[PDB]
Amino acid sequence: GTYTLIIRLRHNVIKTGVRMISLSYSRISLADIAQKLQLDSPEDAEFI
Amino acid sequence: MYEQLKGEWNRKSPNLSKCGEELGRLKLVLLELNFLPTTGTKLTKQQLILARDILEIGAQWSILRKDIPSFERYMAQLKCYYFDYKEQLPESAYMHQLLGLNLLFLLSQNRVAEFHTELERLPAKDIQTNVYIKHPVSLEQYLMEGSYNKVFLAKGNIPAESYTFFIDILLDTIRDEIAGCIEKAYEKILFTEATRILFFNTPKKMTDYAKKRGWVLGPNNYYSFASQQQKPEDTTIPSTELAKQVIEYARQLEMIV
Amino acid sequence: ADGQATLLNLLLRNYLHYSLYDQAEKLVSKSVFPEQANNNEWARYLYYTGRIKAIQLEYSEARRTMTNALRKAPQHTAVGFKQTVHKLLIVVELLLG
Amino acid sequence: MSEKKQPVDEDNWDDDNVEDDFSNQLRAELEKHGYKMETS
Amino acid sequence: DLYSRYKKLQQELEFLEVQEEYIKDEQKNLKK
Amino acid sequence: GIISLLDEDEPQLKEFALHKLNAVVNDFWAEISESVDKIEVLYEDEGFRSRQFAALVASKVFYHLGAFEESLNYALGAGDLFNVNDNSEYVETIIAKCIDHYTKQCVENADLPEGEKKPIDQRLEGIVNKMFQRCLDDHKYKQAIGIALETRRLDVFEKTILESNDVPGMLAYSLKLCMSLMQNKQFRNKVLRVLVKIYMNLEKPDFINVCQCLIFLDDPQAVSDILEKLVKEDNLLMAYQICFDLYESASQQFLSSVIQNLRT
């Protein structure tokens, strides 16, 4: 009985990811982060 | 069987001289029986299955006339009807499209706490089944992260009913959001790139946004006033607050408590 | 004493498991504090209201009354509710980082 | 003692963090170096 | 009688209140 | 869920709404507890035909939430429908508010009742003695003596000397228990001066209590008045313990001041 909490972790995975990427890489193309996060789209890679 | 209603309820009578009789019809419901959930007499359902069908359609034309305070009046009463453990219809062709409709408009009410407390009432109906309710919960999930295009791909995908007044508030609360998030550290943008980030081709609506906030109208330019310079070099704000805190250390250090 | 305590955990036990109002009521409940509840009904009392702030999005306030609900507990082994709080306590910390 | 009124029902830590890193990334990274010399 | 059960029992809260204030003086006065 | 229909402006829905505000006053008691309190608006809007029962459910709901006076001022202004029902565990909740508020009001009104006095509602004062009539008629006089002091009133204490309880020694051993817990000289002398002009007006006038009180009261002429009755009665046997308890207890200056009233 915890599934409604589990389903909203996709916001926290991607904020953990964007902190990891911005701390690792300094000058990274926005059309490279999406292929690494398997976002399938660079047009919202600006948007996150 | 005391109905007085079965002639002009399905056909559109938009804000005509029926709703005054209709509420007076609902007033005459109250003289017969209360809308107490009628714990006894389970077989008699004409006060329950025939009377709630009036109250769910009475919620339905509330949104076509843009009647916001009386809209949640009927919808809260329907919520107090499916709380009954007495066996009813489990649903109809309306229950998903009304309960999840409340989910979609309370989204527009900008109250996320009540958005997630509905989720007790249907554990399995969110992902693995009930696809018409999977669409609103996936929508606000996409509003949670930065995703904006997939939000409007769901504005290319409205399957269930019209949902028109809801997504237009969802238009409006995104319009100021991008007009909010145009104010990040951006460079010169011409009058095509951030002109098409919302929807618009080239109306004067961009001048409404470019004169509301900055990013000044120039020679095909959005001017960046990316300053963020004024606030630092503050010793005083610690020097007021820490001088309070250091005394608080000496309070629970020497004097007996 | 001890009538303010047990009658509220036993009030919560399916009010959490229902969607009835019962959560902002326990905000404006004055009976939040019975101030002493014999160290075992007090210890899970902070847990039953610990899931309440978790399920209605109050994250950072919840993790300190989840932790306090874990470390006021006895020395038993067949502990299947402690199997639940040790799961739930760091659900909400995954929500925080 | 040891009651808990029931209402409902090193050697290990450092490698767990090391299990976190190479969980699904180059476990037996042994022979790709033999195949990366002619590519790179 | 029952009327004396409260009047005499509030009479000693009058009497109890000094004593905790009294030793509060002597936690510091003996140190000096 | 009936809270949403509180803006109809047809009044007959409100009496249909308050029909549900009593029997299920414990489950959506969670709901209309702090979010909606719109009772006082229709309470002030000149209908009326209601605001009677409207102040009951707020006297219910502010009670448990610690706003006892917010319940109590509504419990005052609710009228008859609040006080028509007293066969429950709720009547103990409301007289422990009101009478306690009454006696902590009258202690202030024992000081200065004249000038800027408080708006004593007739229901605020009328259920005091009514419950005291419930004590006079339910056989209990160890507490009929009690609240009669706790009301801090002179004449209702004088009233209950003639009651359904006879006087062998009750109201005479009361002052034995009243002098021990006697708080000040201010409430003492006012009560004690009227109790002993009725002891002379009793059937058999008690003599040691009317002397013991009077030296506590310092009336250097009143004992000479009842001495003159004993001169008129002409027996020194009953004119004896009025006199040597006067010599044993009283002050020298009091005996030197009362002697003018004995020789005249």
Coordinates of N, CA and C in Angstrom, one line a residue, chain F residues 100-188:
Chain F
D100 N -19.2 28.1 36.1 CA -17.9 28.5 36.3 C -17.5 29.9 35.8
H101 N -18.0 30.2 34.6 CA -17.9 31.6 34.2 C -18.7 32.5 35.0
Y102 N -19.8 32.1 35.5 CA -20.7 32.9 36.4 C -20.0 33.3 37.7
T103 N -19.4 32.3 38.4 CA -18.8 32.5 39.7 C -17.5 33.2 39.5
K104 N -16.7 33.1 38.4 CA -15.6 33.9 38.2 C -15.9 35.3 37.7
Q105 N -17.1 35.5 37.3 CA -17.6 36.8 37.0 C -18.1 37.5 38.3
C106 N -18.8 36.8 39.2 CA -19.3 37.4 40.4 C -18.3 37.7 41.4
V107 N -17.1 37.0 41.4 CA -16.0 37.4 42.2 C -15.5 38.8 41.8
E108 N -15.4 39.1 40.5 CA -15.2 40.5 40.1 C -16.4 41.4 40.4
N109 N -17.6 40.9 40.4 CA -18.7 41.6 40.8 C -18.9 41.6 42.3
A110 N -18.2 40.8 43.0 CA -18.1 41.0 44.5 C -17.3 42.2 44.8
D111 N -16.4 42.6 43.9 CA -15.6 43.8 44.1 C -16.3 45.1 43.8
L112 N -16.7 45.2 42.5 CA -17.3 46.4 42.0 C -18.5 46.0 41.1
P113 N -19.7 45.8 41.6 CA -20.8 45.6 40.7 C -21.5 46.8 40.2
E114 N -21.1 48.0 40.8 CA -21.8 49.2 40.5 C -20.8 50.0 39.6
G115 N -21.3 50.4 38.4 CA -20.5 51.1 37.5 C -19.7 50.1 36.6
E116 N -19.8 50.3 35.3 CA -19.3 49.5 34.2 C -19.5 48.0 34.5
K117 N -20.7 47.6 34.9 CA -21.0 46.3 35.2 C -21.2 45.5 33.9
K118 N -21.1 44.2 34.0 CA -21.1 43.3 32.8 C -22.5 43.1 32.4
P119 N -22.7 42.9 31.1 CA -24.1 42.6 30.6 C -24.6 41.2 31.0
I120 N -25.1 41.1 32.2 CA -25.6 39.9 32.8 C -26.8 39.5 32.0
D121 N -26.7 38.5 31.2 CA -27.9 38.0 30.5 C -28.8 37.3 31.4
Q122 N -30.1 37.4 31.1 CA -31.1 36.8 32.0 C -31.1 35.2 31.9
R123 N -30.6 34.7 30.8 CA -30.2 33.3 30.8 C -28.9 33.0 31.5
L124 N -28.0 34.0 31.5 CA -26.8 33.8 32.3 C -27.0 33.8 33.8
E125 N -28.0 34.5 34.3 CA -28.4 34.5 35.7 C -29.5 33.6 36.0
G126 N -30.3 33.1 35.0 CA -31.5 32.4 35.3 C -31.4 30.9 35.3
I127 N -30.3 30.4 34.7 CA -30.0 29.0 34.9 C -29.1 28.7 36.1
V128 N -28.6 29.8 36.7 CA -27.8 29.6 37.9 C -28.7 29.1 39.1
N129 N -29.8 29.9 39.4 CA -30.7 29.5 40.4 C -31.6 28.3 40.0
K130 N -31.8 28.1 38.7 CA -32.6 27.0 38.2 C -32.0 25.7 38.5
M131 N -30.7 25.6 38.2 CA -29.9 24.4 38.6 C -29.8 24.4 40.2
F132 N -29.8 25.6 40.8 CA -29.8 25.6 42.3 C -31.2 25.1 42.8
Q133 N -32.3 25.4 42.0 CA -33.6 24.8 42.3 C -33.5 23.3 42.0
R134 N -32.7 22.8 41.1 CA -32.5 21.4 40.9 C -31.8 20.8 42.1
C135 N -31.0 21.6 42.8 CA -30.3 21.1 44.0 C -31.2 21.2 45.2
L136 N -32.1 22.2 45.3 CA -33.0 22.3 46.5 C -34.0 21.2 46.5
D137 N -34.4 20.7 45.3 CA -35.5 19.7 45.2 C -35.0 18.3 45.0
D138 N -33.7 18.1 44.8 CA -33.2 16.7 44.7 C -32.4 16.3 46.0
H139 N -32.9 16.8 47.2 CA -32.6 16.2 48.5 C -31.2 16.4 49.0
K140 N -30.3 17.0 48.2 CA -28.9 17.2 48.5 C -28.8 18.6 49.1
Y141 N -28.4 18.7 50.4 CA -28.2 19.9 51.1 C -26.8 20.1 51.6
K142 N -25.9 19.1 51.4 CA -24.5 19.3 51.5 C -23.9 20.1 50.3
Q143 N -24.7 20.2 49.2 CA -24.3 21.0 48.1 C -25.3 22.1 47.9
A144 N -26.5 22.1 48.4 CA -27.4 23.2 48.4 C -26.8 24.3 49.3
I145 N -26.1 23.9 50.4 CA -25.3 24.9 51.1 C -24.1 25.4 50.3
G146 N -23.6 24.6 49.4 CA -22.4 24.9 48.7 C -22.5 26.0 47.7
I147 N -23.3 25.8 46.6 CA -23.4 26.8 45.6 C -24.0 28.1 46.1
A148 N -24.8 28.0 47.2 CA -25.4 29.2 47.9 C -24.3 30.1 48.4
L149 N -23.2 29.5 48.8 CA -22.0 30.3 49.1 C -21.3 30.7 47.7
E150 N -21.3 29.8 46.8 CA -20.5 30.0 45.6 C -21.1 31.0 44.6
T151 N -22.4 31.3 44.8 CA -23.0 32.4 44.1 C -22.6 33.7 44.6
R152 N -22.0 33.8 45.8 CA -21.5 35.0 46.5 C -22.6 36.0 46.7
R153 N -23.8 35.5 47.0 CA -25.0 36.3 47.2 C -25.6 36.1 48.5
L154 N -26.1 37.2 49.1 CA -26.5 37.2 50.5 C -27.9 36.6 50.7
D155 N -28.9 37.1 49.9 CA -30.3 36.8 50.2 C -30.7 35.4 49.8
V156 N -30.1 34.8 48.8 CA -30.5 33.4 48.4 C -30.0 32.5 49.4
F157 N -28.9 32.8 50.1 CA -28.4 32.1 51.3 C -29.4 32.3 52.4
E158 N -29.9 33.5 52.6 CA -31.0 33.7 53.6 C -32.3 33.0 53.2
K159 N -32.5 32.8 51.9 CA -33.8 32.2 51.4 C -33.8 30.7 51.8
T160 N -32.7 30.0 51.7 CA -32.7 28.6 51.9 C -32.6 28.2 53.4
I161 N -32.9 29.1 54.3 CA -33.0 28.7 55.7 C -34.4 28.0 55.9
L162 N -35.4 28.4 55.0 CA -36.7 27.7 55.0 C -36.7 26.9 53.7
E163 N -36.6 25.6 53.8 CA -36.4 24.8 52.7 C -37.1 23.4 53.0
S164 N -36.9 22.4 52.2 CA -37.4 21.1 52.4 C -36.5 20.3 53.4
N165 N -35.5 21.0 54.0 CA -34.7 20.4 55.0 C -34.8 21.2 56.2
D166 N -35.2 20.5 57.3 CA -35.5 21.1 58.6 C -34.2 21.6 59.2
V167 N -34.3 22.4 60.3 CA -33.2 23.0 61.0 C -33.1 22.5 62.4
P168 N -32.6 21.3 62.7 CA -32.0 21.1 64.0 C -30.7 21.8 64.2
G169 N -29.8 21.5 63.3 CA -28.5 22.1 63.4 C -27.9 22.5 62.1
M170 N -28.5 22.1 61.0 CA -28.1 22.6 59.7 C -28.4 24.1 59.6
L171 N -27.4 24.8 58.9 CA -27.2 26.3 58.9 C -26.7 26.8 60.2
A172 N -26.5 25.9 61.2 CA -25.8 26.3 62.4 C -24.4 25.7 62.5
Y173 N -24.2 24.4 62.1 CA -22.9 23.9 61.9 C -22.3 24.3 60.6
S174 N -23.0 25.0 59.7 CA -22.5 25.5 58.5 C -21.5 26.6 58.8
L175 N -21.8 27.5 59.6 CA -20.9 28.6 60.0 C -19.7 28.2 60.8
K176 N -19.8 27.0 61.4 CA -18.6 26.4 62.0 C -17.7 25.9 60.9
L177 N -18.2 25.5 59.8 CA -17.4 25.2 58.6 C -17.1 26.4 57.7
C178 N -18.0 27.4 57.8 CA -17.7 28.6 57.0 C -16.7 29.5 57.6
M179 N -16.6 29.6 58.9 CA -15.6 30.4 59.6 C -14.2 29.9 59.4
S180 N -14.0 28.6 59.2 CA -12.7 28.0 59.1 C -12.1 28.3 57.7
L181 N -12.9 28.2 56.6 CA -12.5 28.5 55.3 C -12.8 29.9 54.9
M182 N -13.1 30.8 55.9 CA -13.5 32.2 55.6 C -12.4 33.0 55.0
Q183 N -12.6 33.5 53.8 CA -11.5 34.0 53.0 C -11.0 35.4 53.5
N184 N -11.9 36.4 53.5 CA -11.6 37.7 53.9 C -12.5 38.2 55.0
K185 N -12.3 39.5 55.4 CA -13.3 40.1 56.3 C -14.4 40.8 55.5
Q186 N -14.2 40.9 54.1 CA -15.2 41.7 53.4 C -16.4 40.9 53.1
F187 N -16.3 39.6 52.6 CA -17.5 38.8 52.4 C -18.0 38.3 53.7
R188 N -17.2 38.2 54.8 CA -17.6 37.6 56.0 C -18.6 38.4 56.8

